[PDB]
Amino acid sequence: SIWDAIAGCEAGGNWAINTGNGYYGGVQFDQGTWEANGGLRYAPRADLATREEQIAVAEVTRLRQGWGAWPVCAARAGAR
Template sequence: MCESGDNYRENTGNGFYGAYQFSQQTWTSLGYPGRPDLEPPAMQDAAARKLQAESGWGQWPACSAALGLT
């Protein structure tokens, strides 16, 4: 909700995509195909869980700080 307003199709042209505002490089490095905003919500959710498990909440600094996670 914090990153994109829960919009899985979010693409504002800033180089970050989907509900969790993945960069294309991060998305691809996690092993996912295509572009995040064009992939199904379940895939975006799985990618976010994987990224958080591998790298922590710091991947989403503004949101994690606002939620008291960092």
């Protein structure tokens, strides 16, 4: 559950957060990155997808992009 720690850091654990800052949901995806990593299969934006679906897209993103996708929070979670 490394993603729960990242989501604590990115979003205070609110997987449905949508504050209008350019980023969405528990791990603060921008829209380009949600769609490029297959997110539209699940929901129109990351905050409209479930925690499990957001993690699924985040696993694809990490494999494609690395942890550099979450510049501080991945470190705070112990990440590779």
